[PDB]
Each structure stands twice: as structure tokens, then as C-alpha cells.
Amino acid sequence: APVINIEDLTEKDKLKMEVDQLKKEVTLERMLVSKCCEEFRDYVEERSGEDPLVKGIPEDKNPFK
Amino acid sequence: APVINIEDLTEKDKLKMEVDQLKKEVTLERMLVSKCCEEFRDYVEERSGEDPLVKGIPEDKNPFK
Amino acid sequence: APVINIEDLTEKDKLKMEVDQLKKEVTLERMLVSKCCEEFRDYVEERSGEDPLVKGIPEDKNPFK
Amino acid sequence: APVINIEDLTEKDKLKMEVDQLKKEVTLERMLVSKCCEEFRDYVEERSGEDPLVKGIPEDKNPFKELK
Amino acid sequence: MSELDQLRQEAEQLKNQIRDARKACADATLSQITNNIDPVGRIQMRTRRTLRGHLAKIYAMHWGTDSRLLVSASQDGKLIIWDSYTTNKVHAIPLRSSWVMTCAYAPSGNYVACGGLDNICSIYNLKTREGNVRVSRELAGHTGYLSCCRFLDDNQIVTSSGDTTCALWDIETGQQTTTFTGHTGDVMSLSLAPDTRLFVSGACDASAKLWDVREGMCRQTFTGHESDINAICFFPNGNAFATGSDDATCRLFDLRADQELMTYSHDNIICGITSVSFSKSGRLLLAGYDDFNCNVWDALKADRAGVLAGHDNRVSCLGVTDDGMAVATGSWDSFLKIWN
Amino acid sequence: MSELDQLRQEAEQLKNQIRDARKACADATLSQITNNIDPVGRIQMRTRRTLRGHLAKIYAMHWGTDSRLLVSASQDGKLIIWDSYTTNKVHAIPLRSSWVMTCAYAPSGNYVACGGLDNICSIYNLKTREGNVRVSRELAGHTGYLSCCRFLDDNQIVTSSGDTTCALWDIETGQQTTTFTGHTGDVMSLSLAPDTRLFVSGACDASAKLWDVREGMCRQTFTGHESDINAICFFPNGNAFATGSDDATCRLFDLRADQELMTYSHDNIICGITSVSFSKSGRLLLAGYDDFNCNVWDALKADRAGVLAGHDNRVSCLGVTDDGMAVATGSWDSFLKIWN
Amino acid sequence: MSELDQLRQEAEQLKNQIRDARKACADATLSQITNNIDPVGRIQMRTRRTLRGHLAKIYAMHWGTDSRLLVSASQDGKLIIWDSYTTNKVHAIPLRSSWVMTCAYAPSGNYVACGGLDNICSIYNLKTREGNVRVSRELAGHTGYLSCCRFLDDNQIVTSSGDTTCALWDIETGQQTTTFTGHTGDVMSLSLAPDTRLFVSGACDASAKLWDVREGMCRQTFTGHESDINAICFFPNGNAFATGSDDATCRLFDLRADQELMTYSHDNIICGITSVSFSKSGRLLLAGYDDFNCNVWDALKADRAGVLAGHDNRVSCLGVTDDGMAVATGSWDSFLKIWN
Amino acid sequence: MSELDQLRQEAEQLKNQIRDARKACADATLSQITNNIDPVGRIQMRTRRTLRGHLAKIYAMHWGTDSRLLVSASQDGKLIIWDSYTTNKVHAIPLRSSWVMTCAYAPSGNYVACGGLDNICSIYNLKTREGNVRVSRELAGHTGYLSCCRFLDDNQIVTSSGDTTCALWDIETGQQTTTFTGHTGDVMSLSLAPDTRLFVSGACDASAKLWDVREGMCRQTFTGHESDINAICFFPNGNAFATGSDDATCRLFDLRADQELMTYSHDNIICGITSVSFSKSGRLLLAGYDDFNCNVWDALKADRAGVLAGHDNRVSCLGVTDDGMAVATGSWDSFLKIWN
């Protein structure tokens, strides 16, 4: 949208916007949380092996040493 | 005040009053929902069989028609 | 098609046949129970009405009256 | 069977003995699993402290160390 | 500044503690505990009466002690006392205001009350003053609409209001004996416990509160709903109560449990609930819906056992006779309907 | 060497994999998915007929496809063909053995079959016989009691035996065309798929098996029961079946899922199940119990919608007519009753 | 309009539908999907650096893209740009208002920003201007405190404010390019998507909202939290984000799922979360609490993998370096600490 | 027919009754109760020693109460006793039989025992007889292989056998003092309680039974595993015990609960469990697997904390020292490995 001032909005204004935002979200194509969890798991799994905080940082490669 | 009361307190007074109510509720001795459910079941069960709306009413005995 | 006399089988014969079956079953393409449940529901629903034992039978049409 | 009866029963005497065992078992006073889980959790909690295999042990104190 | 932070953070921690304490006690739902219970099946009630008389949307109704006489109120500013049996209008009280939101019948049968956007609860003597039914009292003191009222006796009545409060009134003196404050939204309805020692209120803050009538204080606040509680009804034994809400669900709360025992809803029912009532035994929980229908739930199985379909408009109110022989449904279509 | 070691281990691992593969698909029970479906409404069937004759316990019964005639087996060594409509005993066949365990009515109405501790499935010619009804064939081969039998047509019949096997017989030659081996315990019941291309068997090994009639092999084996399966019946669409067990539960198993969809039991029903059968639509799952009653389950909701109570002894068999108009219960009390 | 506002009821009805739609997709949780996953091994990070310099409560900190330089903000009116490797503060910018609440580091490293109760987001040039590091711009427009700010680039910054809105700014012209309104409560934090096409805000209304930068609209609003969302952080891949709240829990939300994947909490943790951040892989979700502690959660197992305990007062903020090499924690104890 | 089916009826009903009784008590899992407990992280044990000597598959092992001298046997009929600390044969006892399924160590360390397909339990005095160390007692009685044996004391030993019975012996008379009958399947192992006054056995009938040593009877039977229980191990406090099984799952059982508290298994672990043992605190549950590997489970959080990999063949046995200092693993690869 543009740039709007809140002071310029009345009760009716807001309620109407709320309903108009509600009308758009209701149409969302929601993915199954299982699928999302799988994709999430896979992503983290393909990278944690090289995560300094997880695997540990060697006392020679640590910049804060 | 005297009997009635008009809630015209300050924000600090409302919150204060709020934690005061919460502090009361937090000390509540709660019954397990399982025991509550069983009691609710035993109460209704010894009465539902003769509940006019559950068992229906014989034509002749209906105060309405 | 085949006919077998269980007396012609030894403990070893039975085992081999057992794991042969298991090997066949492991490759079974299993459907989601939710999906099987929905299809089961739909099938039953398309017929619940026309079920003398569910819907009931008019006395004049009840052959066992 | 028991010591006073090494083995001497029929294919029906056993059914009687099985139900007798079941009659006794059915009346076992059973504790709630959560209750057992808390006592278990607790026992292990005031114990995991000195568990060698959990907290490890220094080589110098490790019974299966080197030679010195 | 002052210690405003420590107060809001304290409120939160306490809230967190209450949620955790409740969580630990939530070991099952009614539906599971009722495994061995047979459903009542499919309930099919028929309209036995269509009380026609109002020319405008009905907003409230209340059966009287005799389960025959019942009072109704509509936007035309009229309070009609009907004799359900005969379908005779025993009274047609003109009202100083048209926007009536509630009505109650005194247990004695000697008075009726009502109110709404006028912010006034008017008592009307019916019996003792045979002739023209005149307003004997106008309880004023609330700074918002009267959403609900219920008589404890002839000289005492409790009221709920959009002003966020409820009050116990001494009728004769017209004074607010006690003021119940706590809700953070318009209180939409109230129900008095059978023993009258306590009563409950449902509000727009999506919570229900249990109050001790005598001490004037809040004992417990029940949550779970995610919308305004338009209706609230005490259960026969005084240990539980149901709620109707705009989140399209009815709920059963237990005082001792301090939380709900069960929620009644289907993913295909999205409209708000206006009213709630228990059948005599409490086995059935009947609720009025914005979709013009009344869904009767098997309270123990959570089955939607029946539907009372007949109104061409929003079912705004409903009630079950004391003898539990029938149920009345009020609707915006101006009609009242008795069913059984 | 290993040989047997590796084989019995190989077997265990495969069972684990299947279990794991099944859990991976277990994601809902039938009652959950049927949340929005209305409950059936208390099923209250009344006894229409009381077929009296067998002066001894009835062990089995099968309805003829005309929904009028049916055959019952009794320990008094008599196979009786009844006209349920008139209550008249159309035939009272004396048997060579009083221990009949099963009986079957051929789809054609021309023959009936039966067998028991005699390990024989005897076929009786009803029609063609110009006069008295005589045995045409005695099928011998099983080395254990005949637990159940069902014709495919006049020349074909499938049997189940306490000897752990099932068999397809060519009655003309009196020979077994196919043997079905796999169970590790007495087979107690069998049920043919609506198209007769498959059949399912339940046995004392606590498992049910799906067999391909033509191929002569086990397609799948379903588990879940904690005790022997005494009853089994195919669901109308051919993709599912119900089982009755000594564990006091009935189960609905789906072929595509390869596991159960729902269990039906009350923790206060501890007695065994002798018989199981669906209503025409499959909405109701009727089951006979050792407690003298038949419970009618709502297949979709998993609730008990009704009870058939009239036998003064164990209900041993039951069946619903092809027209879905009646249900017959056979009992150790000597009687058969028709309900609707 | 009139009595029942079609809008107010339409809002409820739509909220109900969305709830039903989400519940339908909520089959499992993340921790159930990760059972096979082995635990990460107890994280025992240690302080490698203790940045000393502040004399009062630190409220914000933000790593620079070089994973070495960082800026912090304190209520004493000071904005310090430190060097985490040498503990040398490169700058010590005194501020007009002492009540700072936020600070950001421009991706380029050329500027930093901050704001708070003065409702202004002041931009500072500390590069191309050798000498007295002065405020380049003072973004005025918010009628409420600045709760958080993040640069998209040198000329663009997004702010969130206690006035209920968020806004995109053109620093050159000092004007608001886009305003993001929708929240009904004070926005507390925001997080830019990896590609800066979207950003997410968490507010006191207990909801988080995803906004599209270019189109300047709100695409989704996540719910679940029981109170204020004080912190928020985009996940590395941009398909999920975590939040910290006064309800004592951190949550992981997935944009496609339109709801949460997992909740991280222990019933013995009742205080509030002030900040939240992910490790480079996403395996860890680090959170700062009001109890002076920082918990490192195993994002997949929902286990607490570790606990950074090193502050004598509330850990007000924390951030993980872009290179995943270290994590810094700011606190009301005046100190900042780097761990790994 | 027959009284037999009546006893059959009674048994089934009692069985279901017990199932329902336990169902009422299974109110939570151990993992759900340990949610607040932090995981141990990742256990990483390394092999300290590798006891070489056996020229064939090791089938068992047992530490001496001194936590240093351990006995072990193998398919090459060699009951070897070693000094774990130094890695050397303190004894190398050749047995007349190579098929040794078990071996025990006297709590006094004065004797040992072993047996297998020979259906005998041979005791060996390793001290009171200088130089020539041989069988000072052979216990004959069992009509099936000796699967496991455990020393009560110098003159008392209890054994389990494929003959489907466990037995208490008096070494002096060689007489089976007490017999324990109840299992309907070949017993595979036993484990004494801390007091030794009671013991528990795991049999092929997929059930573990608790027996009173003095009374020689069955206290209770435990179910759960859907396959044979290869191993069993009493918990340090004597109120619970673990079991290893072919269904690839380890389970925790509680004597007072009369049912399991937890199951340990991952859907990708399908090989059977051979051995099972607790760490000193009981925090860790180690199990030996057919996949040549041993997994260490966090008993509290049900997480797989680690895995002792190192055996070229199936891990057949494993024991944890009395001082909890180390664990030893026996494998079909003929080698033993100490881990600390």
C-alpha cells in the first residue's frame, strides 16, 4: 500500500481493514505441518555438521582465542 | 464506595488489582479433569433416562401438541 | 491353484515359506489410514439412508410383521 | 510345576492353573505410571552425579588407563 | 517512572503459572471418559407452538416457574407474557425503550424485569397489582446497556452490563447492594448458581468469571474461548457451567477443575452462538446459532444429536422449562417456538 | 553354521519393518475423521420371529440369498432350513455327527453345507433331489475340525479348519483345488469378498489373512488382536473387513492401508465375540457376545447404537439378510430370532 | 451497522474458518518428526570476550556483517561500536536521549542507528566522515517509541514502533516510503528475511505478522502465543521464523504452514524471553531470558542443549554472527559477552 | 462344548480385565515426565582394551563383583577368566561342550558356572582348588538348553532353560530346590533383584515374569514386546527392570505399575536386541544389537545418547562393572572390548 496515518483512521476504518485482511488470509493454501517439519529437518540436517556452535570450534581456528 | 463503585482508576491501579486477583487464582486447588468428568458423567447418567427431551414424550402425555 | 499337504513340510520348510511371505508383504504399498477412512465414510454415507436397519421400515412394508 | 510337582498335569489341569494365576493377578494393586516415572526420574536424578559413564573420568584416575 | 514493568511482568508469570498448573490437571476430556456411555442418538424435536405476536426481532425470553408461562422481549419495545399451552397472550407490556436486550421472570411469578440500551433494569409487578401492569422499579446505576438480569427473589436481582460490570440490587431501595468488577470487556450474560451463593458471567474479554454473590468478589476466571461469550448457563448441580461464543463453540467448565472439561463444535460450523441451555438432566446442551438453527449436543458424547430448524432468522435466545418437558427458541424473525 | 538362526532372525526383522511401515501410515482413527457425521439415532430392533426347534445349542446359521430362507446348525445333529417369513421348518436334516460347527447356504438355494469335529464338509442337495434331501458329497481332506465354509457357486466351496489351513474345493470331483496355508493356529472363520476373487480368514494365531482365491496365496496378513479371531466378515465394498475376537473387541481393517481403521469395545465389555456382520450400507457392525447379547456398533462413530437382548444364553452366530431387511441371531439357548 | 455490526461478526467468522483450516493441517510436531535424530551433545560454550565499557543497562546489540564489529545501546545515552576480537571500542557515540531501546548496524558497515522513547530513529555516519561521528539523519514520523530497526541498505531502514506500526524509510529524504499497519498492539521487534523481500514483526497483541516490503502489505499473521512477542528472528532458509514471548516460550513458525512447527518451554520456566536467534545451521535456537539466563535449544529435539549463564541481570539481547562463529549477549548488568 | 471352553472363557475375560486395568493406569510416559530434565547430550566412549584369546564366537560374559575379573565363554568351549586391567587369561577352562549359551560369576569370586545345549549347569571352583581348575559340580535336571544362570551364592544358583522353566539349585546336593513354571515358551534369561529374594525372567512367549525365590511362584507377568525377550536386567533400585527383544525395542518395566514405563527404539532400527544393562545411576540403558553395534539410551529422555561401534560381528553380550567404571562387550567376532 502507501503511507498511512493512524490518527486518520476511525473505528469503522480499522474494522473494515481487519475484515479485508482476514478475507485474504482465509484463502491461504496451508501446507501440512508434517511436510514443513520434514523440509525443516532435512535443511538443518544437511548443515549442523559444520555448525561451529554445534560441532565445536577448534582452539586454533577460533578468532576469539 | 458506600455500596456501588465506579472504575475510574489509573493504569497502575488496574494492573496492581490484576496481579492481586491472579495471586488469588494461582493458589487454587484444582481437581483433575478426569475426576470432574467422571462425576459429571455419573450425575447425568442417573437422570438422563427420564429426561423428557432425551427419551421423548408419549402423545397423550404431552402438555403441548 | 496349488494344493499342499502340511505334513509334507518340515520346520525348515515352514520358516522359509514364512520369510518368503514377509518379504512379499514388506513391499506392500500402504495407503494413509486417513484417506482410507474418508473413502470408507463416503461409501457408507452414500447408503446410510437406504438401510432398513438404520432408517427403519414402514410396518406396511416390513415382511417380518 | 513347583518343586513339589516337577511335571504332572493334563491339557486341562493347566487351564485351571492359568486362571488361578490370573485371578490373583487381576487384583494386583497397580501404581500410576506417572507416579512410577517420577520416582524413577528422582532415583536416577540423585544418582547421575557420580555416574562414571555419564560424566566421564580423568585418564589418571581411569582404571583402564595406560601403564604409568 | 514507577514500577509498571514489575507489575506487568508479574501478571504474566502468574498467568504462565496458572496455565502450567491447569495443564498438569488436564488429563482427559469428557468424550474419552464417556467411552462406555451409549449416545442418545439422533434427537428429533418438533415445533409444538409458534407464538406469533411480536412484529420485531426478539432478543430475550425466560420461562417461568410453571413451565407454561414465559416472557419475551422484542425491539418493538414490548414484553409479552404468553401462556404457551393456550398460545394466549396474558400480557403485552409497552416499554419505555424499544431496544430491549434482556428479560427475566421472578421465581414467585409476581414480577418480570427487562432492560437494554436504556441502561435500566425495569421491574414490572404483574400479580399483586391486578389491572394495568406498571413498572414498579427502574434500577439505574450502570453506565452501559443491560445485557442480562436474573432474580434471586422478589427483592433482589443481578444484572450484567456493557459497562464491564454486574451488580446485585435491592429492588425496593433501587440501590446497587454490590458491584462486581473485574472483566475487561462488555459482560454479555450471567447465570445464577442453583444455591444462589454464586453466579457466573460471560464477557467480551473472552472469559467467564465466578463471583460469590454475598462477598462481591471474583473467585475464578475461566478461559479457552477466542471470542465473546454471548451466553452462559449453570449446570444443574452447581459444579459446572456452559458457554456460547462467537468462536462458534460451546464449552463446559467445571469449578473444581478451574478449566474446561469439553468443547462442542464441528469444523463446518463457523457462525457465533447466541444462547446456551441444558436439558433437565444435563445430558443435552442446546445452543442458538446465528445461522437460524439450534444445535442440540449430546453433552456426554459431544455428538451433535439434533437440530431445531424452523426460524428464518438468527436464533437469539432459548430456554428449557423447569419440568424439562419443552424448549423455547426466540429468533429475530419475531417468532417464539416451543419444541419437544 | 547358522541356517535356522539367520532365517528366524530374517523373519523378525521383516516383521519389524512392516510394523514400522504401518505406524508411518497410522495417522487417524475412523471416529476422528467422522467427527461431523450425525449419530444414527438409537437402534431399537424388536424380535419379529423366534424359530424354535433345535432342542440343543445352535452353532451356526447362514441366510439364503432370498432373504427369507436360512439354515441353522445345532448340536442335536440337525441341519434345519427355516422359512423365516412363516416360521415353517422347510427341512430338518439329520446329520451323521452332532458336532456341526458350520453350515452354509449356496447362493443358488440348491444346496447347503456343514461340518464340525468330523473334519468333513458335507454338501446337501436340496432342490434337484426329486423328493427327500440327501447328501451329495462329503469333502474330506482336512485333518482338523471344520470351522467355517462358504460356497462360491454350486461346484465350488471354501473351507477353514482347526488344522491351520483353508481350502478351495471342486465339489464335483470332491477334491481340494487349492490349499491356503500360512496361519500358525486353528482357523476359526472365513469370509468371501463380494466378487469372490478374494476371501479373508481369522484364526487362533490372532491374525487375519487375505487370500487370492485363484492364485492360491496369501496377499496380506493383518494383526492387532490380542486373542484368537472367532469371527470375520467382508465389508460391502471389498476394501475392508471386520473381525470379532476373544479380546472383547471388533476391528475394521482396510486392505489398502494394510492395518485397522477402528476398534470397537468398551472397557466394561470383557467377554468374547463369536460373530460379526455389517448392515447393508455398512453403517452398523453387529456382533454377538458370550454374554448373551448382540451389540450393534455405529461403524463410523465407533459407538454402541443398540443392543439385541433376547437370548438366555451365548449368541453364537448372526447374519443380516441380503436385502438388509433383517438380522438373525443363533444362540446356545436353542433359538434363532429375526430382528428389524 | 445497527446493533450487530456485520463486520464485527464477519471478523469472528473468518477467524474461525482460519482456525479450522490450520487445525486441519496440524497433524504432528517437529520433535515427533525428529525422533531418529540423535541429541547434539551438551553445548558448553564459554565466554571468550567480555566487552567492558557501559555504566548502565544495555538494551540492544547487533552484529555487523563482518562477524567481528558490533554495536550496542544503553540507557546511559551511549552507542558503542566494539571490535569483538580485540575488545577495543572503535566508537563511543553519545546520544541525546538516554532511554535507547534499539540499535542496528548497516549491512555495509558505514552506519548504525538507534532510537527509543524519543520516538526517533537516528542514523549515524561513522565511515566516509572522518572526525566527529555525527548523526546523519533523524527519522521522525512515529508517534510511539522506536522498538526495533534494521537497515535494508544504506538508504533504507525498517522500523517498528510502540505506536502499533512498522515503516520503511528513505533515509536520504528522511521520509516514510511505506507504513505497515495492522497490529493492534505495540510492535516490539522485527526481522528481515534473508533476501529482504519480506520482514516479520512481533507485537504485544500476541501475534507475529509477515509483511511484503515492495507491495507494502501484510501477507500472513501468526498466532499461538499467550502474550507479548518481545523477540523475533528469521530462520536461515527464510521459510520459518522463531519468536520469544512473555508467555515463557519460543516458537518456530513456518510461512507455508501458516502456523507453528514447535514450541520450546519447560513448565519450570515461567519468566519472559527478551531475544531469540538461530545458529548457522538452524540446529540451535538461542534465547535470552529475564531470569538472567540464556538457553540454547535444540531446534529439532526441542531439548535444552545448553545454558549460557554469565550475567548478573536480565540478558536483554543476543545475536549470532553471520559466519556462525560466535554469539553475543547483552545485559542490564552493563556487560556484553561473546561465546562459542 | 466341554468344561474346557468354560475355563477358556474365564481366562480370556481375566486377561481382558487385566488389560483394561493397566490401561487405566498408563497415564503418561517417562519421557513426558522428564521434559524438564536436560539430556546428557552425546555419550562418546572409546575402547580401552580388547580381550583377545577366544578362537570362536563369544556367547556370554560376566564381571566379577570386584569390577576387574570377568569370565567369558565361546563356541570353542573355552570358559576364560581374564584380568581386565592388565588384559590376560587368569583362567582358561576348556569345557566338554563347545555350545556354551551362558556363564556366571560367583559374587564371592570363588566359583563360576556355564552351560548350553548340554542342558547342564556346571560350577567351577576357581579358588578353593589350587592349579587344576575343574567342574566341582554339575547341575542336572533341565530337559532343555541352559540359556542363562545367575549365582545367588556359593551354594545357590538359579538358571533359566529352553525347557520352559527356571530353577533354584543347592550345589551340595545337586538337587533342584525350587522350580519356576509359568512361561509357555523357552526361557532365554533371568536377572536377580538387589535383594535376590526375587527375580525376573524373559521367555520366548514374549513375557517377563517376576518370581518369589522362597515361594517358587509367579508374582506377575509382563507383556508388551511383540516377540521373544532375549535379555533382561534388574534396575539398581529393584522396582523396575529393562528387557531386550527381537522386535528391536528395549522397554522399561516397573513392578509396582505392572507395566512398562517406556519403550526405546527408532523406526530405522530393526535388528534384535541381545543384551541389555544399566549404567551405575541407571541414567543410561545400554543394549547390544545384531547389527554388530551397541546403542546407549538416555533412559530418562528415551534419546539414543551414543553407540559403541567396534565389533566385526553381532554383539551377543555386554556388562557394566559394579563400580560403574566400565562396560564390556562380547561379540560373535570372538573379541571382547572394554569401553571407558
Swiss-Prot record, chain D:
Keywords: Cell membrane, Lipoprotein, Membrane, Methylation, Prenylation, Transducer. Retinal rod outer segment. GO terms for cellular component: heterotrimeric G-protein complex; photoreceptor disc membrane. Gene3D superfamilies: Transducin (heterotrimeric G protein), gamma chain. G proteins are composed of 3 units, alpha, beta and gamma. PROSITE patterns: G_PROTEIN_GAMMA. The gene is GNGT1. Its main location: membrane. SMART domains: G_gamma, GGL. It is a lipid-anchor. Guanine nucleotide-binding proteins (G proteins) are involved as a modulator or transducer in various transmembrane signaling systems. The beta and gamma chains are required for the GTPase activity, for replacement of GDP by GTP, and for G protein-effector interaction. It is found in: Cell membrane. Belongs to the G protein gamma family. One of its GO terms (biological process) is eye photoreceptor cell development. This is Guanine nucleotide-binding protein G(T) subunit gamma-T1. GO terms for molecular function: G-protein beta-subunit binding. InterPro entries: G-protein_gamma-like_dom (IPR015898), GGL_sf (IPR036284), Gprotein-gamma (IPR001770).
UniProtKB/Swiss-Prot annotation, chains E, F, G, H:
The modification Phosphoserine is found at residue 2. G proteins are composed of 3 units, alpha, beta and gamma. The heterodimer formed by GNB1 and GNG2 interacts with ARHGEF5. The heterodimer formed by GNB1 and GNG2 interacts with GRK2. Forms a complex with GNAO1 and GNG3. Interacts with ARHGEF18 and RASD2. Forms complexes with TAS2R14 and G-proteins; these complexes play a role in the perception of bitterness. Component of the TAS2R14-GNAI1 complex, consisting of TAS2R14, GNAI1, GNB1 and GNG2. Component of the TAS2R14-GNAT3 complex, consisting of TAS2R14, GNAT3, GNB1 and GNG2. It comes from the Eukaryota. Phosphorylation at His-266 by NDKB contributes to G protein activation by increasing the high energetic phosphate transfer onto GDP. Keywords: Acetylation, Phosphoprotein, Repeat, Transducer, WD repeat. The modification Phosphohistidine is found at residue 266. The keyword Repeat applies. One of its GO terms (cellular component) is membrane. The modification N-acetylserine is found at residue 2. WD repeats lie at residues 46-94, 95-140, 141-181, 182-223, 224-267, 268-309, 310-340. Guanine nucleotide-binding proteins (G proteins) are involved as a modulator or transducer in various transmembrane signaling systems. The beta and gamma chains are required for the GTPase activity, for replacement of GDP by GTP, and for G protein-effector interaction. One of its GO terms (biological process) is cellular response to catecholamine stimulus. GO terms for molecular function: GTPase activity; GTPase binding; protein-containing complex binding; signaling receptor complex adaptor activity. SUPFAM superfamilies: WD40 repeat-like. Belongs to the WD repeat G protein beta family. The gene is GNB1. This is Guanine nucleotide-binding protein G(I)/G(S)/G(T) subunit beta-1. It holds the Pfam family WD40_Gbeta.
